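Usage example:
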Amino acid sequence: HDGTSCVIDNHHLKSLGAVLNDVRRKKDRIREAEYEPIIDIADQYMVTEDPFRGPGKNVRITLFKEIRRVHPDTMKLVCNWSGKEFLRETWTRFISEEFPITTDQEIMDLWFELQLRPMHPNRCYKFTMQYALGAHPDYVAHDVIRQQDPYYVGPNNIERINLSKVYNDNFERFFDDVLWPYFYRPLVYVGTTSAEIEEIMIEVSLLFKIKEFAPDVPLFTGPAY
Amino acid sequence: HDGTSCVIDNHHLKSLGAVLNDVRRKKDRIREAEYEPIIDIADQYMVTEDPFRGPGKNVRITLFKEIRRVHPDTMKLVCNWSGKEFLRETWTRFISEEFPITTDQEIMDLWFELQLRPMHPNRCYKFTMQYALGAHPDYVAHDVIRQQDPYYVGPNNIERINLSKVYNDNFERFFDDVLWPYFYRPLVYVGTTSAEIEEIMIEVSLLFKIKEFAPDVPLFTGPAY
Amino acid sequence: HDGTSCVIDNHHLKSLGAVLNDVRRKKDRIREAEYEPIIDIADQYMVTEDPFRGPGKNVRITLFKEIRRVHPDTMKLVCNWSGKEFLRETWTRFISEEFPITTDQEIMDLWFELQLRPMHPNRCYKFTMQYALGAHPDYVAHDVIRQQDPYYVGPNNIERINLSKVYNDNFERFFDDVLWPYFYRPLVYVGTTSAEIEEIMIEVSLLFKIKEFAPDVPLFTGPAY
Amino acid sequence: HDGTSCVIDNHHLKSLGAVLNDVRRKKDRIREAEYEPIIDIADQYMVTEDPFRGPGKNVRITLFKEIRRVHPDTMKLVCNWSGKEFLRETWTRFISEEFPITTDQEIMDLWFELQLRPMHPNRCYKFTMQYALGAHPDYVAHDVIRQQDPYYVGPNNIERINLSKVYNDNFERFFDDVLWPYFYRPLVYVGTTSAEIEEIMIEVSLLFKIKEFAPDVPLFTGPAY
Amino acid sequence: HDGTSCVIDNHHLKSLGAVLNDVRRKKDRIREAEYEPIIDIADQYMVTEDPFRGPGKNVRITLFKEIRRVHPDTMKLVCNWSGKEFLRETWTRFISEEFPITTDQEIMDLWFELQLRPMHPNRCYKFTMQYALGAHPDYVAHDVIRQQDPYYVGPNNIERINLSKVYNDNFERFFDDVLWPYFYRPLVYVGTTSAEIEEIMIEVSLLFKIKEFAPDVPLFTGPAY
Amino acid sequence: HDGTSCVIDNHHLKSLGAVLNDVRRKKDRIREAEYEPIIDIADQYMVTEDPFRGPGKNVRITLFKEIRRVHPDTMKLVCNWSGKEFLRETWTRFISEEFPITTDQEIMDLWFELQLRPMHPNRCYKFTMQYALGAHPDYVAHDVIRQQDPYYVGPNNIERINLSKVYNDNFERFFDDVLWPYFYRPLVYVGTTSAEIEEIMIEVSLLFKIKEFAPDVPLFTGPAY
Amino acid sequence: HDGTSCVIDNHHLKSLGAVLNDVRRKKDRIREAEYEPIIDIADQYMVTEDPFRGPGKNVRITLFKEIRRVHPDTMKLVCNWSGKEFLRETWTRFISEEFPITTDQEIMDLWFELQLRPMHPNRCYKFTMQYALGAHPDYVAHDVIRQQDPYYVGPNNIERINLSKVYNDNFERFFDDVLWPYFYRPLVYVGTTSAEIEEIMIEVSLLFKIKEFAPDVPLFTGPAY
Amino acid sequence: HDGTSCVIDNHHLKSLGAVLNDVRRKKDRIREAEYEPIIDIADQYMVTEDPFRGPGKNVRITLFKEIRRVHPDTMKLVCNWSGKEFLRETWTRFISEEFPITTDQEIMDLWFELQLRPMHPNRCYKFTMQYALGAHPDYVAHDVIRQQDPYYVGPNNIERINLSKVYNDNFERFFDDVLWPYFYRPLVYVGTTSAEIEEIMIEVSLLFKIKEFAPDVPLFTGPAY
Amino acid sequence: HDGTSCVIDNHHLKSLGAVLNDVRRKKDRIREAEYEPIIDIADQYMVTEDPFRGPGKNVRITLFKEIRRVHPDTMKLVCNWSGKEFLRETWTRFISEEFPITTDQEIMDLWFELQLRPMHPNRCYKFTMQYALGAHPDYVAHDVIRQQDPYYVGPNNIERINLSKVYNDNFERFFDDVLWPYFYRPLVYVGTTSAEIEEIMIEVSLLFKIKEFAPDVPLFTGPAY
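Running the assembly step on the lines above writes:
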């Protein structure tokens, strides 16, 4: 909206910068049209919207923190819960944080979130991760493993693993309705790309993606009207 | 409107070319913003909209054609009418061409138009012009003059000189209402930039710029309704 | 003024960035000189300084606002004053706003200003304008006309039409000294480029360009000295 | 780590190339920061890490080779096993190749891999593929079909189809524990984009993506310690 | 640290902008490597770190100000002290400003600093300087000299001349320990590049570059511990 | 020397690439000439050739190594020799390494060289240095000091401090001929830019720059001729 | 040869512009080497040196001038000599102009040269040419022909046709030694690309390319020595 | 010829785009002049106009087609005519196609044209050629030879070999006037760059380049006038 | 100062090229500001002004010329004066050339200048230099030495070595006041980078840098006033 127009003796004057901008935009538009066929080649393919910046809200149910020291070329176990203990923490923490649930809503996805921090300054390394999502209830995960083709955690040191992909409620009901409560539990390992031992802070959360169906209606103090 | 969106297991996919275009446009927009201050410097000044491509309609009342041969460094007289004859041609040709005048309208401007054509192929020169818009009624313009600081006609070989900047009607009324009918008449000369004699076709028109105020109403066959 | 100079054992040290800048400026200056002949070609022509950002001060005598809805391809009349009413508003509003006039000054120009606003969000169209500056006092302008080769209002939705192009004073004196008070009045129409009806806010002002000749002298409380 | 530093009479000298590099990097860093907002627009989206260059190791259990000649616009059947025969080959080849299994591990994914080779030099065409992953056990796949909206195999002539989306063990146990052993079997077709018959070598493998959880402990000759 | 990582069905997703940045950095790194041999050519040479932005702290012992008017092509004397008076000012001002000296320290360098200011706005010229660092004690410097191959003061109008390039102490001790106290004194001249007389403010300081060897120990209120 | 020439029927043929290269070089040469005036602006200034890559040979008389741990914002003393011990090491090590001295030669410069290495991988910091070149023989340098405007060691982690800025010989003669043997000794400190303690390897050498005047004559086994 | 070198306290200073030029040339040389393989591709082919700017000297034996007017799409005959008359002019003019022939020499080539000039200014067209080099002695060339796939004369309006692609001597000897004197004669036509008749000046010369074998010896006035 | 000119109150207005184009052309012209010296370096050499797109008309006397299969690294004989049979085909086909010859004309050149086509789609190879233009009449060319430094046929798969670089007539006259009719005959071989056998269509033509000297006269029905 | 301004009906016109230049300069200024932070990084370092193009005047006291032939990889002695003879030449030549000394002045620096010329055309090599500035008075320099890490003379074949970094007077006074007259003498060697013997012209000068303190006063013919 730069510039302006005026009329002197029937003649229409227009701001020079606006006119030169109109010319430039024409030039750019021709260039854009000339190479528009390449966009259609690129449009044979698609990318995925970031699930956490994307649709649904994020509810971050932080679970715990722990410090581990990790030898080079190894990974340390983050958590060793039974399926029951994982379910107890998942159910209790989510329900305790979210109640009262006042809207219709659906959990789109449940993510296991690792937030990883170096405990020392002036270090240069990146984080690695490996996981399993279940095991024989009598299988106890090794506390430390060797690194073998791990996941490389992205530059922001956050990794999120998808786990998935209002009535009266309690944990016993929830647990009884789970078919294999003792089998499924995230067993997650964290390592680094460092050639020295590193001390790391691990913060574990459950990130729930939720879509609410909130009606376009007022909340009134009772009685209504 | 390239590309599309789809949802698979809650996840939103978008066309790659569209995304890369969004990124590119962001990049261009940053560049545009970075140098936007220069547009404001340019916007301290204005340019004039072309009167003939601009507002008002064009009514081209062609008057006559003539062939002249023009010696180098000279200009030949196009027209030598008295003021009365110029007014007779202006009034008669416009009114005869435009009647019936069925709308409210105003003449914004009257232009004397020279359309100039070379009469030979394989020539390379441009046209020149000089003029006077009035003279003592007893002054007869020279048929040929020497070129001295002329107007250079633009590349499209058209030059337009502004001259300006429904009741029962007739020329005698018009003429009687003009104050100095014998003084004002365009006296126009045409030359070239050629070093040889050139044969030129000269076509002279009066170009009227008109704005109509046509009501947003139907024309009915009488009687209406 | 970056960098600095110092002397060690007669030897003069100078900041490296300043020196590299001196070299770069030399390079730029050579480039500028090499293509300076093109500036002289461009300097065969001139542009007009924006009258409102340019010399003289702006005194905006706002007159009125009105809302009009405009059908596609039509224009609605903004004002239908007689010449007398236009003169009354022009004189009364300017003089009432500007008095006391304490300096010698001259009105350079008088502009009729349209400020145009869409009354709805999420619309995409531009404004158009047509006008007449006078009419037979018995001519009443059509309330709505069809659009025909209009003025296109610039991107900032402001159009200004030039109308032009201390003693005891009163409107009757002013009116008596105007030769054709009932003939000259701006009759202005506003339309859009929209294919739907649009609701528009029209704000009309008179913009006076004024140059003051204020002496370089003190104002004292009387008596002076 | 180019260049160096030295001190002469308290004054610090530094290598010129290193300094000019520091200046250049500053320049690049400013440019990077200026357009960093576009990275955030791109970061609204994500791409998928190549599963075979990505986490987990690759175990390529090659199954068989075959030569087929393929008419233009047709595709030839690669394999026509029953579900039982597919399971026998999958189980037998994997277990025979991998035993002894000395670590805890999980199969992340099972991929059906087509490696495709032209059997003639100086040809120019690309490969196509279609598949089904199961069928009525009494359905026998056509040996040859017409090409209709196929998968286009990428430039490296390898296509991988995901099929998925230590105790004493034997095939009879495995087979008995599969619910619908006779229904699921990859039925894969290969064609080309050629306008002539082409002779093609087809090599079929099962590619297992495996993550091992190898403890960070020694292997000793028994008895340990 | 833009973007992030997540895992869906074993597959690793990474932010698109981060990936495109990894690609771009690879591209830049290849370019940097390709032309790295030129850095080694540049590294055959070195530049000097700015002594005042460089190591050691700056202690600016301002001495005096004076206004001089300087004719074109001439330089005016800034100071005409004897060696004794220069030593008295140097010793007294430094010691009076710096005591108490609570750390081990060494003066790296002593600089004579001219800060030069135009006394009028809307002038365009640069400053010049000439100097001698000693003279026969019976030599009295000319108050004004002609300019001949002077030092050109850098754009920031500061010139610094190197002059060089805790016990009980007093000036008489200092003076007695100087071998030729009456010979060494800065005799400094200031001119301009102007073709008119210019009025200039001259501010003279002694700038001491000092390195302190402050132990990494506490200061306690006595008695300690 | 690409391409070639041949003659066919008196006509001279020349390789096309060579001709296009001649044209390109002409183009480059014009560009070089056009901006050659900027080189002369840059040539108002000079840079210093790297003393160690430059004239004279380098004789690196390594003296000792030591490991120090350095707290953030502090510097640790490298050496605390008396002047006598510094002279003993300088004389003994140089003479023992260089004898037999078989040519006329001159020591251009003596440099104190610090080679600095991090003792841990995956660290990111740079080194700092401060020094004194002499002190009261009864002054014992602090083992650790706080960092204050230090020298920043260049990217290659080498810093060199200039110290400067055949007959029968022995140390007692050398020592007796030194005027102030106990005063001059390099007292050098090393720190880092790290926010944590760092363990550093310090290697100290004396680097002698030597020019030899070796005659252009044979060495013969005696007797000659 | 810009800049210079100097030595201060063993240290070598070099002009900054020269150093930056050394760096730039290194950069250019790397670029040149990187793309040098393309020169070898271009060097698979050769171009011909201009015969007239190339080896041998040019002796221009001008023969005659003539003016012809040429209708569009036609060509006019330049010359209609018999073979005998062509030989007489060739022999007589060359020998009369060149004698005395004082050196050993060889005619490399004989060229028929047309120099073509427009006789009018402000025309825009190019020249065309057709020719025959011999004909039945009883064949008389048409004075005017239609243009059919002619040679287009280059921008400099010169066309040269190769015709080829000391003893006592006379024309009768020369003529008798020619085998078919009456058959070979250049019959040359000139036209234009103009759509109008053009008046053209035609200047015809014989251009002899000659190589002399002049001994590296003095000319003396007789008797020698 | 974009834009236009008009005159308002003596002042000359010109289209902005035309003016900016005049400025741009000035800029381009300066650039062209700056590097014009390189054109003169390139003009030391010349290239040859394509004989078939160049002067003279093309008369393509197609002779025959044949299919050959060619083993890798070999070439197959195209034609094995005696000189007499080659002359019979050349004479008969040209004269039969061209009669009636109604104009004076000259054959500039005779070319042997190979048009080569792959007989299969989806192949990637180029063609090669070798030839001899004559042989002992008792020499019979080998049907197949090995490829050794052949001509590589250009991308358009056409190769043309120059062979060279109105009275009552008959073949017996023509044959009797040829000196060595049985010796000269094109013996041409065609191969490929393929590593497999290829089936090729070979089409052989004689391409005559002809210049006609058609008089600029009418053809009349007899009797004329 | 291109273009101009004019006023028509209160409106200000300005030259188009000047306006476009104002816009361009704004654009350049934004770019300059955007990257100005890099200048400050470069300004952490300084370069040295060329001493000979820099402050002080140059007085070139040429001493002698000599021709030497230099074998590859060797250097030839330029001068072998005793300290006394060097002092005699330095004193005598300077004082004889400079008297009468009519101004107060100071020698800033004394430089030993080698000007080196090839004695043959069509050679391609550079010059080298080595030197000593003093020696035992009984040390006679070798006439020829082998090249070992020499100074490389800059492209302009001039090398300058700093040696440093009105009463009745005579050489005996000067000599008596020098402390070690027989020790200090420049002993300079010159070589080349050639692989063949080269014949070189060596011209040796003493270049004095002098600053004069000429008072801004008239010289009058006596008696003054």
